[PDB]
């Protein structure tokens, strides 16, 4: 059993065979395949260029570096979200435009399996492909799993609001990886005519952005957004991006005389200087002093005129997006622990009175975008029904989650539905055994909790209950069925209704069953509140 | 009245409407339109590259930076030459390849007005387009006024005398702006088939250089050189440019091992380091210790084999230049105050004996190029007729002016005439009220004094006499008539004869009238003196 | 007699006429003609790019810089090997892609003389073209002599073992100069259809590498390797080059996270930093502490997939190489003084016992590649026949020479012969009067000793005996005859048999005569020892 070697457009790559319990045949894995030229030097803040071809056989058996990011938050996220038994050491580099492939196909024969391309999350600031082991999903469901990387943070999203640094470099990377998949995936036994993009959090927003982008035409055939869409407004910068660009430049020690000056100066800084700039900006944290409307906890997607021609809201109203089957889902308690913990969010005392709730909601402006005049109505609605300050804290977490994830996700699915595309929603409500031990036991369906199920963590890690094992089997089959057919349903599975005018969705957890009208009262409350 | 928005080849630009007293309709102004890619990084000391196109609408309502230059001399020149009521704050940057447009045309209709493209002065070392407000000229004469920028100083003119840094980058910028005008000016209501280039001092030399250059073919149809031509020898470096190149490199902290080494090293220096290099070289100053033949108060035009194929003298003798109508003029006292003040020239004591005159003329070698053996004849001719040391100083200033401006200008006009082209000359003899208060009251027709009239300073600034107002009206109409027709004459205007074999020219001032044989005895004296 | 001016593809070049005693007509010399763009900045560790064309006439009368290298070893080598009367001052620069031409042809008439292109030696770490004056060879034999430069050391040979820095930049330079010769040499009176490559030491290995390379197709018609071939294993790195690449990066102060990171970081270092890196690595020295198998005294040729598709041994076994006439030769005592002196090799005490011999042979692993288990047999064979420790030292020097030069050269000639190509060998056995005064008088046919004869040092330097004069005349005629005809023989010359199955070769020295079976017993001993 000599190792698997296949042809890419840029030359040959060598992978490794790995076995999984319960399967007679191994899965072929390829780690660290480049899909573009490393974006170093003058290639910073420019679109991804094609990779240089290589002679002989590239050894693709080592994990690539993760894109430069805060190593504290980035390592923490990898540890909390990995489906693998052990945490892998990951290097940081600007040289990070790699993908990893897991294929169960026999590479000596023509195979055209459905391909699932995973776009990780981490607020467009942190994260790695290598965190997510495709082995279980590939073997259990007979799909090719591709995990991709894309530039993060300053490297990925620096925008001057004009032609000197349009922005969205990370998204163009995601597009470039999808073009690589079109050109190459058949050598790995994948069907370039059946590509499903899926991602969580910022990866779900990225998926949503690709559904909105003419650059992504002909590159995918199904989409799945898990806890994140293009209406998750913390990730999309509308209006004037030039003052945040200037703040970044000034922090880096660059003059702000013109756009071209700022971008040129930043292209001169070392990786290290830019990482120090990143840390000094205190991204992924809330500012508790200063005008909340000027606070930017992350850099993000911009309306650049190449990837996105208008705002997501405008493109939606026009029905100008790709009408592929789209599954959009949320977890029950999206702001229950993970996100506030990662942001060092002030709610640690375990309780909240209504006056404190109101100033904190105001400080939370970059996350929720609620004008100071709307704060009292918003707060009263969620917290005003109880005098218990412990329960006020919990309802406050629901408020944040509803505004960041629940409402945006339902709005996106309704528009997608009304454009005539097949649409499905879920709400995931389970507390995984793989949860952090600092996470309170009452938090069920936290941000990220579905990832263990989707990626088959019970098959790779120790300690899963029988119920968790079955939950993962069901979720993987739903997801792969959707990749195959644009419909997650099939034999042995609870019925998942289409999200049509009755708004059927699947509640996923210990008691998986269909329900209707996910977040309906919350969409009505918020959209009408925001409309003055 | 929504703001004016028009299409360029690189995308849409938004300007602003501005009103002028006595005109019912406003003028559309566009500030800071890029005509090339910012020449940063590896684009230093290389020709201008095309601008990157932009999405959406570029807001062209802020003044661009001026090209990097000594801020003392550059700010001073802007204050002394601006026709505007107030001094505008200007930034310095290498990112300076912009132009500003003033158009009186209705941009919703096809308009094809004559276009006048202004090339500012400042010894190819300082200056800015934004100094010159086109509003009055555009409204009074119904022309499109374009003020352009071009690289200055080291950035603009660094030459190794070979293919690694040919030089004349500022001139190729001027050519690139003219190509932009050809491609775009119709959207601004201009006639690309009627473009007049005009400039003063180094801008007049630039105009003269374009008349001599095959690169400028088909780019303009009339020319005007005000106090500066390609025979103003201080601006043109013939012979060996490599020792000044080496001195620049050494000052910057670069090795001089080869040409390519020097240019590559200089491309690594920060803007600031190069500006510090500029100041340490003491450009725009006379060296009063050391061999005057090695003194270089400015970098300048070189014979690079692309822009200029031979020396101006050789091209003239061959009649190898563009035979467009050309107006060439001087002021009465070109070295009366402005230039010696800007150069910290030694003549401040108000008088000069004949022995001191002679060593000072020798120190003035980079300005006048008079061999030490010719000094006594030159000095005797100008100063030898009086024993009054005050009047010796004044005749000495005439000597300098005659050699730098008067003689060169007449030689250029005679050659242009003898090639069969329409040619006109003027001598401007007026002391503007806008003169500096440090300028002695006896100086009339100083370097720059015509600019107030040409640009309609009486219509924008406070304090002009009725006579100044009429002088500007006359000068603007002469200039615009020339732009339209290649002949400045028209109804209501004093008769301006062609510069033909009788050498008629116009004396412009309080008593505007025709005369003959401008500087005839001075051309005879100097050309024969220089011919040993 | 105005100076010679000729047309190249990139523009005109001006040379100088130089006279040589005994010749009525001068030789035209051109020094410092560029054949590529200077490899500065982003062009480091990339193939040579075409030179930028120039206007007017390039003055080619100054020696170019030598490629950046250790100035101690590089200056020393130039002084020891120059055939010229005096040592010329040479600058160091990365800007070094120049060649020098010596032509005896009348440049006003069509001349098509044989061209001999010299590739200097210096272990791919040091050396210069300008060291070798082509004047005598050009005049005596009526050939055009071209001496070329190529990148050395880190600049020339840095390889990551993949597509981010393939390596062999110096060899691609050699190829680029040969393409320049094809395109241009006719203007210098040379026949582009008769080009002979010749070189010594690393230059002989380079010649051998070109015979093995599909890139060199159609670029030469005869080859001569003097004391160096592609089987001189110290110059060719097989197996894993990544740890030496990492050591270089670490020494330079670069991270080793990925290949692209290392190469990008090294492209940021100044020439000086890289030269300091070079010196800190102690190239051209033996490491007397540490594992000899990890010791790298030079960077070298790699199997890059562009220049060399497989190992030299593999290409030979396949008969996949250019079957041009090839003369391969060695000197009698290749390790007699020059090389051990340049490497600060431990054998200075003048004697060697057998136990010390054995550990020193082990330390010499990077030069000879003899596995520790083979050491006792190798040492016994050479030193075991005498108890005289002085003679043991001399036999030890023979051992090294046989493994580095003698055996490899004969193997190469046998393979070339067996492919059906015309092949000739020599062994040079003379002690030049131009030898260093530190060289012991008993050393005859040291590394480099033939260069004086080949380049006509007796005609340019002082002090040659009549016999040396005749030896040089004979050697130059043999070499030039070979350039003309692929056969060195001719009237007035001792008979030089073909290297056929009888293995005839020429012993060159005071008594020049044919012999047979050069190093036959040594090839048998070593090839069978290495085959376990
Ligand atoms: C590929 O690389 C791994 C290290 O990641 C190494 O162990 C393995 O030997 C390599 N395989 C081949 C065939 O070179
Ligand atoms: C254009 O920029 C100016 C500042 O220079 C600003 O005041 C104005 O609002 C801008 N106009 C538009 C339409 O954005
Ligand atoms: C060429 O350069 C040399 C210096 O290397 C100089 O002496 C000679 O004058 C030059 N020749 C010409 C014609 O410029």
Numbering used by the authors:
A (entry chain A), B (entry chain A), C (entry chain A): 21 to 552
The authors write:
The active site occupies a 10-15Å deep hydrophobic pocket at the interface of the three domains with all three catalytic residues arranged such that a proton transfer chain can be established.
The structure-function relationship of this aglycosylated hCES1 was explored alongside the wild type enzyme and a catalytically inactive mutant (S221A). The HEK Gnt1-/- mutant cell line in which N-glycosylation is restricted to GlcNAc2Man5 was used for generating stable cell lines. In all three structures, the asymmetric unit contained one monomer of hCES1, containing, two disulphide bridges were present, C87- C116 and C274—C285 as seen in other hCES1 structures. In the crystal structure of hCES1 and hCES1 S221A, an N-acetylglucosamine adduct was observed attached to the side chain of residue N79. Space group symmetry was used to generate the biological trimer that is seen in solution. Superposition of the monomeric structures showed no differences between the glycosylated and aglycosylated hCES1.
